[PDB]
């Protein structure tokens, strides 16, 4: 509907697609088998971002008061984008930067904002993978290192921190992070963390060395192991002890918080992190399929698995949450019994079970504090620790293949490295570059920096890219051409569910969410949680205000990608003059 | 422990990975 002259020149002819699959055998990559593509989509729409984020947000709002908005916006904003990205990639036979640049030359900004976003989410998730590997490397020890405290110079006093806190809390904050008392206290580089980061990047490079030539074989183990091990943990979880108590707790949501715009905003932004939408990897990956590939059926199958896996992982977390709360209730109970037995042959504790289940975990605690403590209480605790960190490591890796795709393909399409040089060279330099940037999260104050990416700074860009993709495919390229295109690829025009969601519903929902993501989220003061053993009520939570200069970080990490979209468009409409 | 067990695990994993990287580089060159 917007005037777009010259479109037919830039994009492949519909008749040219019938004479491209058997003559572009070289120059362009091909999936060996549809299984390889489906296993790659599984790993990118159900890696971390689904399995890591969803469960945290469940327990940070409400067990079931968050799944409702999540599953509504999965259907009405996620399935439509997922289909759109799959189809547009399959038709225009290019990556994100090739696709938006060919729909209109002023939209090369859309593709640069996806490459930067993909860069930033890869930098975040590979630090989480370096932590996961630290814990996997300490999981080959009969007494898991986080099960016991250290000691004093007298070798008769437990470390006061550990004592005032827990071996788990102390192994996370002191033995792993060696955390400082604020973001201003940088300290220095934790060498043992640096070794784990190098390991994460180096494994990723081994799997992504020749893009889909190598990542397509990696996914046979990396997108299949996580799901079997998560099945083993579902069965272990349900038979834990108080597990059924926890699972009743996420299926009795308070509805008073289903009316909280934050629950809707987090669910909004979770739909794009869950599916890895607006990163651009999905467009590149769908561009290597046959032009007659059924992208509608693929988007639906991926979606159904995404929603089902979201709810499944919430069951595995809450069974373990329920187990922890019940062993506290009991413990606390058994000490209130022991106070009057020690007094009568009188201090007491108030500990109902609903006060323990509804005790939120800040940061990455669900993985390195709750699941780690509960694995030590299980028999063969070292075999459950290794399975848990191997599951998470493979999920991380599967997700990292998509995020790497979304940085490598655009840099190939910007022709910035000599074409002569093998891709292996380009992949390697991205791994080295991002490895060096990730030294900031190896500092004494690293977690604090990683928690800034957990702010709205990590989300605004994703909401802006997704909207612009939808808008540009429907109004700049034209939904009518797009329907004739799909009808050519799969044999039938997309039905009225797709027409309503693309033209009105999805764009309008995205707009509302972006608008009210500033009316509340951005307007609120950015605060974070510090671990300082010199704090009154020490093992308790002291949230403080970030310094002013961190605004100079959120302002770029989010702004730049977002502003790349118009910024490049305005550059292109003043070079024309 | 005379050696920390995480360093024995890291060494073996990192060794396997570097041998992987080297095999895949020489394989890629040999694919003519
Ligand atoms: O701690 C977790 C996930 C744990 C987990 C996930 C799955 C499993 C499974 F059940 F699968 F085994 C077990 C543990 N997530 C943190 C997170 O997402 N954030 C982002 C927003 N805010 C933050 O600071 C932290
Ligand atoms: C932890 O950080 C402190 C302060 O930067 C430093 O002195 C110490 O060497 C670090 N190492 C450990 C093991 O805590």
- Identify the H or E element spanning A545: strand A542-545
Pocket test for ligand 1, best of A53, A390, A441 (most atoms within 8 A of CB): A53
- Counting one residue from chain A and one from chain B, the pairs whose CB atoms sit within 8 A come to 40
Contact criterion met (CB < 8 Å) for B10 and A138: no
Give, for A202, the enclosing helix (H) or strand (E). Answer: helix A191-208
Strand, helix or coil for residue A253: coil
State chain B's maximal CA–CA distance in angstroms. 49
Tell if the CB–CB gap between A422 and B28 is shorter than 8 Å: yes
What sign for the dihedral angle of Cα A300, A113, A568, A457?
Answer: positive
The rounded Cα A177 to chain-centroid distance in angstroms is 21
List Cα–Cα distances, A152 to A157, A161, A166, A172, A368, in angstroms.
Answer: 5, 11, 16, 19, 25
Q: Minimal Cα–Cα distance from B6 to chain A, Å?
A: 5
Phi, psi of A403 (to 5 degrees): -65, -35
A347: exposed, middle or buried (C-beta count within 10 Å: 0-12, 13-18, 19+)? Answer: exposed
A137 and B CB contact within 8 Å: yes
Give the side-chain half-sphere CA count within 13 A for A47: 30
Residue of B nearest to A139 (CA): B6
CA distances from A421 to A87, A205, A240, A289 (A): 31, 17, 54, 26
DSSP three-state, residue B10: helix
Nearest to A559 by CA among A411, A458, A469: A458
Rg (CA), chain B: 14
Residues A490 and A504 sit within 8 Å (Cβ to Cβ): no
Tokens of A470: 């939808």
Q: A108-137 and A96-103 are packed helices; what angle lies between their axes, rounded to 10 degrees?
A: 160
Angle between helices A261-275 and A506-516 (to 10 degrees): 120
Nearest CA to ligand 1 atom 11: A313
Residue A526 is given by DSSP the state P
- Is residue A380 helix, strand or coil? coil
The single residue listed with the structure tokens 């973001």 is A183
- C-alpha A95/C-alpha A419 separation (Å) is 17
Q: Are A205 and A288 in contact (CB under 8 A)?
A: no
List ligand 1's pocket residues with C-beta within 6 A. A 51-53, 55-56, 230, 233, 313, 316-317, 363-364, 366-367, 371, 451, 454
Contact residues on chain A for B22, CB-CB shorter than 8 A: none
- Of all helices (H) and strands (E), which one includes residue A542? strand A542-545
Distance between CA atoms of A162 and A88, rounded to whole angstroms?
54
Pairwise CA distance, residues A271 & A217, whole Å: 28
DSSP A145: T
For residue A87, give the nearest of A277, A304, A296 by alpha carbon: A296
| Lookup: tokens for A202 | 């180096």
Pick from A253, A300, A308, A257: nearest CA to A495: A300
Residue of chain A minimizing CA distance to B1: A141
In angstroms, rounded to a whole number, what is the distance separating the alpha carbons of residues A102 and A11? 6
CA Rg, chain A, in Å? 25
Residue A572: partners with Cβ closer than 8 Å, 6 or more residues away: A105, A106, A108
Closest CA to A30 of A40, A42, A15, A43: A40
B24 touching chain A per CB within 8 A: yes
Burial profile B4-32: b = 16 or more Cβ within 10 angstroms, e = fewer: eebeebbeebeeebeebbeebeeeeeeee
| CA–CA dist A304, A224 (Å, integer) | 17
- DSSP 8-class letter at A75: I
Smallest Cα distance from A199 to chain B, Å: 6
Q: Which residues in chain A have their CB less than 8 angstroms from residue B19's CB?
A: none
Compute the half-sphere exposure of residue B2: CA atoms within 13 Å on the CB side of its CA.
0
Whose tokens are 């009795």? That residue is A252
**Which segments within A361-423 are labelled E, that is strand?**
none
d(CA A370, CA A279): 31
Q: For residues A426 and A433, what is the distance between their CA atoms, to the nearest angstrom? A: 11
DSSP code for A343: H
CA quadruple A153, A157, A162, A166: dihedral positive or negative? positive
State the DSSP H helix or E strand holding residue A451, giving kind and residue range, or none if neither: helix A446-453
Interface membership of B6 toward A (CB under 8 Å)? yes
Are B24 and A214 within 8 A, CB to CB? yes
Per the CB < 8 A criterion, the answer to whether A14 and A485 are in contact is yes
Residue A337 structure tokens: 């019994």
User: How many whole angstroms separate alpha carbon A275 and alpha carbon A286?
Assistant: 14
């Amino acid at each position: 509907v917007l005037p777009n002259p010259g479109l037919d020149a830039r994009i492949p002819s519909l008749a040219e697609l019938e004479t491209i699959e058997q003559e572009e055998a070289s120059s362009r990559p091909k999936w060996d088998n549809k299984a390889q593509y489906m296993l790659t989509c599984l790993g990118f729409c159900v890696g971390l971002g689904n399995v890591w984020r969803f469960p945290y947000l469940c327990q940070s709002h409400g067990g079931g008061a968050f799944m409702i908005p999540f599953l509504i916006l999965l259907v009405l904003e996620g399935i439509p984008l997922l289909y759109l990205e799959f189809a547009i990639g399959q038709r225009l036979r290019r990556g994100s930067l090739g696709v938006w640049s060919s729909i209109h030359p002023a939209l090369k900004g859309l593709g640069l904002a996806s490459m930067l976003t993909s860069f930033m989410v890869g930098l975040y998730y590979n630090t989480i993978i370096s932590w996961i590997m630290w814990y996997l490397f300490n999981s080959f020890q009969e007494p898991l290192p986080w099960s016991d405290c250290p000691l004093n110079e007298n070798q008769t006093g437990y470390v006061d921190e550990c004592a005032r806190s827990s071996p788990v809390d102390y192994f996370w904050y002191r033995e792993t992070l060696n955390i400082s008392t604020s973001i201003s206290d940088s300290g220095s580089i934790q060498w043992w963390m640096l070794l784990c980061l190098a390991c994460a990047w180096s494994v990723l490079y081994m799997c992504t060395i020749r893009g889909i030539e190598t990542t397509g074989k990696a996914v046979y183990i990396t997108s299949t192991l996580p799901y079997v091990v998560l099945t083993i943990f579902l069965i272990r979880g349900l038979t834990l002890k108080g597990a059924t108590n926890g699972i009743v707790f996420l299926f009795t949501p308070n509805v008073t918080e289903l009316a909280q715009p934050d629950t809707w905003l987090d669910a909004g932004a979770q739909v794009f992190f869950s599916f890895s939408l607006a990163f651009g990897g999905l467009i590149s990956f769908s561009s290597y399929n046959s032009v007659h590939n059924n992208c509608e059926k693929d988007s639906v199958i991926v979606s159904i698995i995404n929603g089902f896996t979201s709810v499944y992982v919430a069951i595995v977390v809450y069974s373990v949450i329920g187990f922890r709360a019940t062993q506290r209730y009991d413990d606390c109970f058994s000490t209130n019994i022991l106070t009057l037995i020690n007094g009568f042959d009188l201090v007491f504790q108030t500990c109902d079970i609903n006060a323990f289940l509804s005790e939120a975990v800040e940061g990455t605690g669900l993985a390195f504090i709750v699941f780690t403590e509960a694995i030590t209480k299980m028999p063969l605790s070292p075999l459950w620790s290794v399975l848990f960190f191997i599951m998470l490591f493979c999920l991380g890796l599967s997700s990292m293949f998509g995020n790497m795709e979304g940085v490598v393909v655009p840099l190939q399409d910007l022709r910035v490295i000599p074409p002569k040089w093998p891709k292996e060279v380009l992949t390697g330099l991205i791994c080295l570059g991002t490895f060096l940037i990730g030294f900031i999260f190896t500092l004494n104050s690293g977690q604090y920096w990683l928690s800034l990416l957990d702010s709205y700074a990590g989300s605004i860009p994703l909401l802006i890219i997704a909207f612009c993709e939808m808008f540009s495919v429907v109004y700049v390229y034209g939904v009518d051409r797009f329907n004739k295109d799909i009808e050519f690829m799969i044999g039938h025009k997309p039905n009225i569910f797709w027409q309503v969601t693309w033209r009105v519903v999805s764009p309008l929902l995205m707009l509302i969410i972006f608008l009210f993501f500033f009316v509340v989220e951005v307007s609120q003061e950015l605060t974070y949680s510090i671990w300082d053993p010199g704090y009154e009520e020490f093992p308790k939570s002291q949230k403080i205000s970030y310094p002013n200069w961190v605004y100079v970080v959120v302002v770029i990490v989010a702004g730049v990608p977002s502003l790349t979209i118009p910024g490049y468009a305005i550059y292109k409409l003043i070079r024309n003059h | 422990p005379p050696v920390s067990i995480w360093l024995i695990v890291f060494g073996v994993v990192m060794g396997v990975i570097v041998v992987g990287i080297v095999i895949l580089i020489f394989t890629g060159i040999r694919d003519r």
